[PDB]
Scaffold this motif. Structure first.
Motif: not given
Ligand code: MG
Ligand code: ZN
Lengths: 653, 1322
Positions: A208, A210, A212
């Motif tokens: 994702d 968020d 990373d």
């Molecule tokens: Mg994540």
RNA sequence: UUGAUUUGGUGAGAGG
DNA sequence: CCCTGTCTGGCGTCCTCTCACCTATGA
DNA sequence: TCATATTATTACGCCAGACAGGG
């Protein structure tokens, strides 16, 4: 080596060797002096324990220590463990020409290329830029080139775009679990400091956005550039190696854009008008004369390839919508129109890409995956598919269901005051009526969401599936299920305490109504258990992968036929309910052992060494074949490896 | 009524339940604990006095001298806190202890001592606590985190399933002392009772009874009841109380009184017991087969022959009965060993016991405890009598004795600290009772069984360690003491106490570095309850149940604020209202409910008290009297949430915030979020960076005020009054007379801490929020700290957010941001970096601080002075030079000159230099000396003159009762003033009184300024060793960029993907672009629906703000503004706020409406928040659409998005995970020493660890050549990598691999054993 | 022939 | 002599980032 | 400064593998 200061941070082995030598010098001096027996026995015993502590510290009674109470690390502790030489410096190494940064989306990319920042690109490609600068003749010595890229003049960015061009890089997300977590892209330079990563590829990395981070690695030599382009390129990994399912499935925004695009409503602009092609379908959508979902007879020309490699055109009028024609402008030639004629959730778009890969091969499937992603993002932007507080429709029947359940628990507890029933039967009756009331509340909200829209067309009313936002996010399969949309509208069930047994008083309030204090505390029981389970489960999952790749570790496909007639008997599996996993899931792409008799009488239906791809499996399903004796890896006769037939299909090829 | 910064911007407070108890001071755990540690508290408990009254008076072993104690004291710290952080010293205080040595003659227990001596000796320095709950340990600011550990006192644990592999339960019982040896009792599957001490070897437990001088008969008297066989007419009849037959099979004929009661075969029922009690049946004649299995209780001897019949605890046979019957012992005592209830566990343990008397019991215990070294009478008796029974080495504290008496159902709660015989016997009896069935086990997660250690307790335990070491030293010096030639510092030593207490405050698992980037984060690192630490559990071992939330956490520990990852639920954070019990347990407030009427009195309970009572819920509807408006109400009885009657309850929850903590009660609409996303939201909300312009959450909970005050980042006024406001340097507050002392005329001068380094490189900065000549009250705020706005708490900023997919740029969790966010600098945060440069004398002479930088040309001498060190403030970047610091003989000269790290920019904000007494370059060192010298005197006189001006006026002011002659009082100007004699009239001593003030002022100013110059005139102040000490403070200003991380308060993480122009944004029909576009697909899966209600309610808040901005910009007279403000503050249901708005003097309406034109701030409290109909009604007061959704056009195409989208204001935060601290790349640089592979990290310019699973992933492909260069050429092989670098720069991509160096390191480490590993044939 | 020290090791906290 | 509790050793997820702290003695 | 050389805490959870005990 000394650390920053004026003292030497000494290693532990120097303490061990210095003690063995101190004791050995003492023992030589005592054997010079002819000390008595007990002195030299203690002296030799201290030397024995010193040597035994040097070699493997702590295998004897409590390990020696220098600073402060922590034991000091010996030679065997330089070998063994998670931080020895095998697991820390020989199997995994730290690596030059490598970089690391935070990822971000960049949806303009084609799926063989990724965005890579200019600062990281000028740092990772310093020797190629040096070689390019020395070839042109701009500078002379190497120093001059290092000053040029230390200053970053105006001419090294053209050098950088001429070293990037056809040179793949290995992007790698930090917990790599399977082989699709290292994929090779071509860089496209980015004004910025974040790796732009093509969105479909994210479902392979479990990435994702968020927070990373990913690492980039540069294939230096020429064989490694060719391995990155020919084996590890992101266009080459479109099927997961664990099965036959495509791994470049469109994940979340794009299936919402498709599910809003290819759908219908019982009245819109341009209901039931007739259109001479998909081009003027998009022209009527753009000019403002029809709607994206308005049912319409179009004339489409689908190319069915019914001959031997020849595409035959058939043109006809399909009763379809505007959006299905606009999406038909992107489908390649060979697929039939009925792949877009339905509503296209997530399972349907996955089998769309799968049928495109099975029919038209790799290159139309790559370019069609990109065109799917582009048109999904564009019409999801045009959709304006928000989420509101009014979208979570409370059932009007919810309060009467809760009061009927409250009357039922009142009857059961009035029997409990008079002692007619037992305590376990009381607890069972309360959990049963709250399960029944939970299912009734879920059916009330699910009717109230799945068919809430009731709009008339030229007269009396007529119903249809709803364009509620949370219902399209659930029905499309983008994000959401029945349970999550259930907890946002209906009651959120009977949460369980950490004792393992359930709690007899449920959480009758959803999230649109407010949870009070006790209900949120029971909810926190149920969610703290889940976070503790994931954060402790991951260690056993990783250690299981380690044990599995170290028992495997050796087995390489090393022949083409072992020359046998033995193999396991693949039947469909049946537990006692309806037939769970069909034979076409188990004998897809595995080479038969002996030739399968047709179920009538003694016919050679398939021969005895044929791979069973989809065409053979369809001719197996037409004849309703009982069970196939197929070749298995455990029956392979190859010494030191597995032959090529007893493995089966390649699974991603 | 309101205070004067409360009338500035009064937040619209939803909330129906009237709060009865205001929020306690949020740092009270740290402050009350450390105020307990240092305080002069007579009667001894608790504190340092407990330590001195335990260790003193020391008397040596009959050495006829006894050093005793009087009193202790802590002097002033030599360094105040700011210059202490700047210099690097501890923030400590000297511990001045009075000690009184008296020395005896021969034969004086009662005799008067021959000589005394007494002095205020100096032992250690203890680190004091700053007023905000922090320490300053070595320059850095650290926090001791309160531990959560098992209470002292007995615990009956089960371990029911896993051992024995047979489903048979065990039952162990641990007596955990606060200090000393652990004693555990435990069953084994042979049903025998075993003792073990300190987890050592296993002894059969009754040996400890045989160690307490108990014979076998006394033990059998304790743990068994006697059955009496009387030798009678025939067959040796039995006394039978009918209780003993409960649930057994009648083996024989049960008859008495000529009547057959119960025959053989049927089990004995309780009706048969009633028949035997009604028929009065005691004596019955038994068969001989009944006694043939029973066990004797006491000893019996044959009287005439004079020998033994049978030992105690011996089973009986028929010939044994023929032995004992013929001798003449008529009574036979047998042990009732009921297979159902009263089991024979002690008796079978006595059969296992290899010992017989007390002495062999002590010898076996001594051979257990200390093996090898022999077991003699004195040594074993001293061991066992000091294991548990001496006050020195075994001490259950008051907590331990309370738990120990409470778990055994004793009456008292206070007793002696050691154990006794009866305590060990009671623990064994309760363990046996639990095995029999009566009574049950305890659980360990139950917070009545779980004590809190805090700062004062932990520092007191370490200080007691230091004191027992110094008393062993005093006992050492005294027996070698010659008198009178020593005074009490040849005996005592300040070294071990200081060493131990700095060992704890420096290097412990709980004295840890403060998370300081945020007022929330400071105030929630100080309120932290860790399960870890010394004596507690570890991160990588345990477990499942201690990581889980137990029903005693309601109101003591936050259920939802615990960090995700390796330690979940070990690092619990304390609730909002939860105090700490006297014993250290967690007691939370409840409202006492006598009858129907819920009383407003509060009463604190812990979990061992919360179980007995019935405690209501916080939100249960009660109207106008306290009567519950229903006849049934949800309560919880014994950890079980159940529905009870109207009139049964004894307590009610105080307020509805009380379940959660101060991190996760700042989240509005918490009750609509999921638990997981509330956890992620609170844990990210701790991580926010302070923005450059603080901006007031439109949707808050009202707990922002208490957090922003109670964390000491704002300059809260000490004494109320007006203001003088010099402020460039300090706020100067004139004090109102009622709060002002009679002497010390006094005006309060607040120090504003301007731009400086936090612990997380953020910028802590205070700005005055009061003007000049403006009234302030006590407790009011004056200067807004980092992340505060007029005393509220502004972590992030509130921005216009649309929920829609926008062209894929917000795909998974990404966030698409306009250019109006980055043009306004509304996230442009300020980071500060400290960089040190030292010129230590490593070897070959000392290093040097000169600009005459070598090899490098006029690209060294630039941002510096004409001859050394970075000048003051320019725009320095990467590769610059800050402090020229290079030696000759190190051509052979070199460049260690501390430069600027790669990638950073900034402005040198400050340069500190307490260098090796000599740093002066030309003559700068003494040049500034005169500057400060003249500075001190100036202010010194100025301040005096300032007071003199106020005093002169005051003299004339009072000059009325003793000379009001205005024309006869203006005589001398700066000379005298009063040339009259008031004498008395009505006491104006006042003139004479003020004369002393000025007289003393000038007299003290001289002395004050005398020391000033003395302090000024100095080389500099620091420690030794280190020579050249130059610290340079850069300050980068980082804006926002593609790759940063933003997040709301609900768990919606995001990496900001595209920074769009203003034009391409989705604008509504009014014309305003939306600022930030989020993604709606996160919301059905991540069930955090509270961000949507925050979005709609923030939209309504800015709707009111736009309406007031229209009414005030298009300027209206204040009647229409006060009518609209009154409508905005009434709004809807029954609330607590309303307002008294017609008392705001026609100007405080206008200043309020000046502070509301950016949006009307709304308090939505935690679980009693704003309902949805009030959101709709507030959206109808503003002229906004009721659905919360506006139709939006597209900035690209100019055409409407179908199906209207949600726009509102979400309070989005910028977390300190910035992308240009994570971006890194490496081609080639430096490596390690031992191995030939590259270094690791970013501060070391190192490469990526290509780990094990990536190697397996390359093996999974056919990447054999990619892996070969990935582990040979790129990483390790030195010949391979130099040949490869030359091959690349020639234009030949080809590797010459060779063998890795770390494998030859493996060969030498394996070969350095006795192992001959080789490499075979070609 | 034109320059230099963290990795080492512990503890604490954080991200995915 | 074949079951058997009991004791001893040997596992327990990858990647990354920030900070602080480092043996006593001694004529 | 330059040789001298190691002691007063406990609180994981399986899971194999080897060992003295006893019917
Ligand atoms: Mg994540
Ligand atoms: Zn084979």
């Amino acid at each position: 080596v000394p650390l920053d200061g004026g003292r030497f941070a000494t290693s532990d082995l120097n303490d061990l060797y210095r003690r063995v030598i101190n004791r050995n010098n003492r023992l030589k001096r005592l054997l010079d002096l002819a000390a008595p027996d007990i002195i030299v026995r203690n002296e030799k015993r201290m030397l024995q324990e010193a040597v035994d502590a040097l070699l493997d510290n702590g295998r004897r009674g409590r390990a020696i220590t220098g600073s402060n109470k922590r034991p000091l690390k010996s030679l065997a502790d330089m070998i063994k463990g998670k931080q020895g030489r095998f697991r820390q410096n020989l199997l995994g190494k730290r690596v030059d020409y490598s970089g690391r940064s935070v990822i971000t989306v960049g949806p303009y990319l084609r799926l063989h290329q990724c965005g890579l920042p200019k600062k990281m690109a000028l740092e990772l490609f310093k020797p190629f830029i040096y070689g390019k600068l020395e070839l042109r003749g701009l500078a002379t010595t190497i120093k001059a080139a290092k000053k040029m890229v230390e200053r970053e003049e105006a001419v090294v960015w053209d050098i950088l775009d001429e070293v990037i061009r056809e040179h793949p890089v290995l992007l790698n997300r930090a917990p790599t679990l399977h082989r699709l977590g290292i994929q090779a892209f071509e860089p496209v330079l980015i004004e910025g400091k974040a790796i732009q990563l093509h969105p479909l590829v994210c479902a392979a990395y479990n990435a994702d956005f968020d927070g990373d981070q990913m690492a980039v690695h540069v294939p230096l030599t020429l064989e490694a550039q060719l391995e990155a382009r020919a084996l590890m390129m992101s266009t080459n990994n479109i099927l997961s190696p664990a099965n036959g399912e495509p791994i470049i499935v469109p994940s979340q925004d794009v299936v919402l854009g498709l599910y809003y695009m290819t759908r219908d409503c019982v009245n819109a602009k341009g209901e039931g008008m007739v259109l001479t092609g998909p081009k003027e379908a998009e022209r009527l959508y753009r000019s403002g004369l029809a709607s994206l979902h308005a049912r319409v007879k179009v004339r489409i020309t689908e190319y069915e390839k019914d001959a031997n490699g020849e595409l035959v055109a058939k043109t006809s009028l399909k009763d379809t919508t505007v959006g299905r024609a606009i999406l038909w402008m992107i489908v390649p030639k060979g697929l039939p129109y009925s792949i877009v004629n339905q509503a296209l959730g997530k399972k349907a778009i996955s089998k769309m890409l799968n049928t495109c890969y099975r029919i038209l091969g790799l290159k139309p499937t790559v370019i069609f995956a990109d065109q799917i992603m582009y048109t999904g993002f564009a019409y999801a932007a045009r959709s304006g598919a928000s989420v509101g507080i009014d979208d979570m429709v409370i059932p009007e029947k919810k309060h009467e269901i809760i009061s009927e359940a409250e009357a039922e628990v009142a009857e059961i507890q009035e029997q409990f005051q008079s002692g007619l029933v037992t305590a376990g039967e009381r607890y069972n009756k309360v959990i049963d009526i709250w399960a029944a009331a939970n299912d009734r509340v879920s059916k009330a909200m699910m009717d109230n969401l799945q068919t809430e829209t009731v709009i008339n067309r030229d007269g009396q009313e007529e119903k249809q599936v709803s364009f509620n936002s949370i219902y399209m996010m659930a029905d499309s399969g983008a994000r959401g299920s029945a349970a999550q949309i259930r907890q946002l509208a209906g009651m959120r069930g009977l949460m369980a305490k950490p004792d393992g047994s359930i709690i007899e008083t449920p959480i009758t309030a959803n999230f649109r109504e407010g949870l009070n204090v006790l209900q949120y505390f029971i909810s926190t029981h149920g969610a703290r258990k889940g976070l503790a389970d994931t954060a402790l489960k991951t260690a056993n999952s990783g250690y299981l992968t380690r044990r599995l790749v170290d028992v495997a570790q050796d087995l390489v496909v090393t022949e083409d036929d072992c020359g046998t007639h033995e193999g396991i008997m693949m039947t469909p599996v049946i537990e006692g309910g309806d037939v769970k996993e069909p034979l076409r899931d188990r004998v897809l792409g595995r080479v038969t052992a002996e030739d399968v008799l047709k179920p009538g009488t003694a016919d050679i239906l398939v021969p005895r060494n044929t791979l069973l791809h989809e065409q053979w499996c369809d001719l197996l399903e037409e004849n309703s074949v009982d069970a196939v004796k197929v070749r298995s890896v455990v029956s392979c006769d190859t010494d030191f490896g597995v032959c090529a037939h007893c493995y089966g299909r390649d699974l991603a090829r | 009524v309101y205070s004067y910064t409360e009338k500035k911007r009064i937040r619209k407070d939803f909330g129906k339940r009237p709060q009865v108890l205001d929020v306690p001071y949020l740092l009270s755990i740290q402050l009350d604990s450390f105020q307990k540690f240092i305080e002069q508290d007579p009667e001894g408990q608790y504190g340092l006095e407990a330590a001195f009254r335990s260790v003193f008076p020391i008397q040596s072993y009959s050495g006829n001298s006894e050093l005793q104690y009087v009193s202790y004291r802590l002097g002033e710290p030599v360094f105040d806190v700011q210059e202490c952080q700047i210099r690097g010293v501890t923030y400590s205080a000297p511990l001045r202890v009075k000690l009184r040595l008296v020395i005896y003659e021969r034969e004086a227990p009662e005799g008067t001592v021959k000589d005394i001596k007494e002095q205020e000796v100096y032992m250690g320095e203890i680190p004091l606590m700053t007023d905000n709950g922090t320490f300053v340990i070595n320059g850095t600011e650290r926090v001791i985190v309160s531990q959560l550990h098992r209470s002292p006192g007995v615990f009956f644990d089960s371990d029911k399933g896993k051992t024995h592999s047979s489903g048979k339960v065990l039952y162990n019982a641990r007596i955990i002392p606060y200090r000393g040896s652990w004693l555990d009792f435990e069953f084994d599957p042979k049903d025998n009772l075993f003792v073990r001490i300190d987890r050592r070897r296993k002894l059969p437990a009754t040996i400890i009874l045989r160690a307490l001088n108990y014979t076998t008969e006394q033990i059998l008297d304790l743990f068994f009841e006697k059955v009496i066989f009387e030798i009678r007419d025939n067959k040796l009849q039995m006394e039978l109380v009918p209780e003993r037959l409960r649930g057994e099979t009648a083996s024989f004929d049960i008859e008495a009184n000529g009547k057959v009661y119960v025959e053989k075969g049927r089990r004995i029922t309780a009706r048969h017991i009633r028949q035997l009690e009604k028929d009065d049946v005691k004596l019955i004649e038994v068969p001989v087969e009944y006694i043939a299995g029973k066990v004797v209780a006491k000893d019996y001897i044959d009287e005439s022959t004079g020998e033994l019949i049978c030992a105690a605890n011996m089973e009986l046979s028929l010939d044994l009965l023929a032995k004992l019957s013929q001798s003449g012992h008529k009574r036979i005592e047998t042990l009732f060993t009921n297979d159902l209830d009263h089991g024979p566990y002690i008796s079978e343990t006595l059969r296992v016991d290899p010992t017989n008397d007390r002495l062999s019991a002590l010898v076996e215990i001594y051979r257990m405890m200390r093996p090898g070294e022999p077991p003699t009478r004195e040594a074993a008796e001293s061991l066992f009598e000091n294991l548990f029974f001496s006050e020195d080495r075994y001490d259950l504290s008051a907590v331990g004795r309370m738990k120990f008496n409470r778990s055994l159902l004793r009456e008292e709660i206070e007793g002696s600290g050691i154990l006794s015989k009866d305590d060990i016997i009671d623990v064994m009896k309760k363990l046996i009772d639990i095995r029999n069935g009566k009574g049950e086990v305890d659980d360990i997660d139950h917070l009545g069984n779980r004590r809190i250690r805090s700062v004062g307790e932990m520092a007191e335990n370490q200080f007691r360690v230091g004191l027992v070491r110094v008393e062993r030293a005093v006992k050492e010096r005294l027996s070698l003491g010659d008198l009178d030639t020593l005074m009490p510092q040849d005996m005592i030593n300040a070294k071990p106490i200081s060493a131990a207490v700095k060992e704890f405050f420096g290097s412990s698992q709980l004295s840890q570095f403060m998370d300081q980037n945020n007022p929330l984060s400071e105030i929630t690192h100080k309120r932290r309850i860790s399960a870890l630490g010394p004596g507690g559990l570890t991160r990588e071992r345990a477990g499942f149940e201690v990581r889980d939330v137990h029903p005693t956490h309601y109101g003591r520990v936050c259920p939802i604020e615990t960090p995700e990852g390796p330690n979940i639920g070990l690092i619990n954070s304390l609730s909002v209202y939860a105090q700490t019990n006297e014993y250290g347990f967690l007691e939370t407030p409840y409202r006492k409910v006598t009858d129907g009427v819920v009383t407003d009195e509060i009463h604190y309970l812990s979990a061992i008290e919360e179980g007995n009572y019935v405690i209501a819920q916080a939100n249960s509807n009660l109207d106008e009297e306290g009567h519950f408006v229903e006849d049934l109400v949800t309560c919880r009885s014994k950890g079980e949430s159940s529905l009870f009657s109207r009139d049964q309850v004894d307590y009610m929850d105080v307020s509805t915030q009380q379940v959660v903590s101060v991190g996760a009660s700042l989240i509005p609409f918490l009750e609509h979020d999921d638990a997981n996303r509330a956890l992620m939201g609170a844990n990210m909300q701790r991580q926010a960076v302070p923005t450059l312009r603080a901006d007031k959450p439109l949707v808050g909970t009202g707990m922002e005020r208490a957090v922003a005050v109670d964390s000491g980042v704002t300059a809260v006024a000490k004494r109320g009054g007006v203001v003088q406001y010099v402020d460039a340097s300090r706020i100067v507050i004139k004090v109102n007379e009622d709060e002002m002392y009679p002497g010390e005329a006094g005006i309060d001068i607040y120090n504003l801490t301007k731009y400086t380094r936090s612990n997380q490189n953020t910028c802590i900065n205070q700005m005055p929020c009061v003007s000049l000549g403006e009234p302030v009250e006590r407790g009011d705020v004056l200067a807004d700290g980092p992340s505060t706005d007029l005393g509220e708490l502004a972590l992030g900023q509130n921005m216009r957010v649309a929920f829609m997919p926008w062209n894929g740029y917000n795909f998974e969790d990404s966030i698409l941001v306009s250019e109006r966010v980055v043009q306004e600098d509304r996230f442009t945060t300020i980071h500060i970096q400290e960089l040190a440069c030292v010129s230590r004398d490593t070897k070959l002479g000392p290093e040097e601080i000169t600009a005459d930088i070598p090899n490098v040309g006029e690209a060294a001498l630039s941002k510096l002075d004409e001859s050394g060190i970075v000048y003051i403030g320019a725009e320095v970047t990467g590769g610059d030079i800050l402090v020229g610091k290079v030696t000759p003989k190190g051509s052979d000269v070199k460049d260690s000159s501390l430069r600027v790290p790669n990638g950073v920019s900034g402005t040198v904000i400050d340069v500190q230099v307490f260098t090796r007494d000599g740093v002066e370059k030309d003559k700068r060192a003494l040049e500034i000396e005169e500057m400060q010298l003249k500075q001190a005197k100036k202010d010194l006189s100025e301040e005096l003159q300032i007071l003199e001006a106020g005093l002169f006026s005051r003299i004339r002011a009072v000059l009325v009762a003793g000379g009001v002659e205005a024309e006869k009082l203006d005589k001398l100007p700066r000379d005298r003033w009063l040339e009259l004699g008031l004498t008395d009239e009505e006491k104006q001593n006042q003139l004479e009184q003020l004369a002393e003030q000025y007289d003393e002022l000038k007299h003290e100013f001289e002395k004050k300024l005398e020391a000033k110059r003395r302090k000024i005139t100095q080389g500099d102040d620091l420690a030794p060793g280190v020579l050249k000490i130059v610290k340079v403070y850069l300050a980068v200003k980082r804006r926002i960029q593609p790759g940063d991380k933003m997040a709301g308060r609900h768990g919606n993480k995001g990496v900001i993907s595209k920074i769009n122009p203003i034009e391409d944004m989705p604008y509504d029909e009014n014309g305003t672009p939306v600022d930030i576009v989020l993604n709606p697909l996160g919301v059905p899966s991540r069930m955090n629906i509270g961000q949507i209600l925050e979005t709609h309610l923030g939209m309504a808040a800015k709707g009111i703000g736009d309406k007031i901005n229209a009414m005030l910009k298009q300027q209206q007279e204040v009647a229409k503004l006060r009518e609209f403000i009154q409508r905005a503050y009434d709004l809807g249901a029954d609330v607590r706020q309303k307002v008294d708005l017609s008392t705001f003097s026609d100007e405080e309406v206008m200043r309020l409406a000046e502070n509301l034109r950016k949006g009307m701030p709304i308090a939505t409290p935690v679980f009693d928040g704003a309902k949805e109909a009030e959101i709709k009604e507030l959206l109808k007061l503003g002229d906004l659409p009721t659905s919360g959704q506006i139709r939006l056009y597209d900035g690209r195409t100019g055409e409407q998005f179908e199906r209207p989208v949600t726009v509102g204001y979400m309070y989005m935060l910028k977390l300190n995970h910035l992308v240009d601290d994570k971006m890194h790349a490496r081609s080639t640089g430096s490596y390690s020493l031992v191995t030939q592979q590259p270094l690791g990290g970013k501060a070391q310019f190192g490469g990526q660890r290509f780990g094990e699973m990536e190697v397996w992933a390359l093996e999974a492909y056919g990447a054999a050549y990619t892996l070969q260069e990935m582990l040979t050429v790129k990483s390790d092989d030195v010949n391979g990598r130099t040949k490869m670098y030359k091959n690349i720069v020639d234009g030949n991509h080809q590797m010459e691999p060779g063998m890795p160096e770390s494998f030859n390191v493996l060969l030498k480490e394996i070969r350095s054993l006795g192992i001959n590993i080789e490499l075979e044939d070609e």
